[PDB]
Design a protein around this ligand. Sequence first.
Ligand code: SF4
Length: 190
Amino acid sequence: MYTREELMEIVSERVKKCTACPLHLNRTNVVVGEGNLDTRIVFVGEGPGEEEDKTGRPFVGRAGMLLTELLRESGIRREDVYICNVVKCRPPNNRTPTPEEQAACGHFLLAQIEIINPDVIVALGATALSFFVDGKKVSITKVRGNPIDWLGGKKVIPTFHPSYLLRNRSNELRRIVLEDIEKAKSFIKK
Ligand code: SF4
């Protein structure tokens, strides 16, 4: 009938045609998401930066290369998981997407999670976290590392966005994010 791959391609073609928010006027390429459609763990960030926009691929700039290393140090190959964002189009000057933009784009993310049907989601940063708590503004610093019970018994573990760890190179902060990723892994089923 229809495979996960075909469903994801339908999402991708709809994203490419999307003009539901002002971000479509700014982006060079939409950035849908990448990796393993049978992952039990999905990583979700905010939205594309410059290198993402140029390539159509998520987490390929500086924050993304850091993410690759966090995953490696957590025993995870990027190819084996799925990585995406709340918004699909790069905002002008890489500004934070507005709540209205996040709301317009969010149905695509919900569709990607429905297709993959993971056990656990790692929400990287405040925008991603907001998505999984009905759009509420909530401090990542205050709630990071605490699992959230989301739809269908899926667990969401919020942590810092890798951008933050670009600016603050402390070992303690890195160890905290690695502990959050390991807590995420512990919710993947047998
Ligand atoms: S950011 Fe999302 S809702 Fe906005 S135009 Fe791009 S694909 Fe559409």
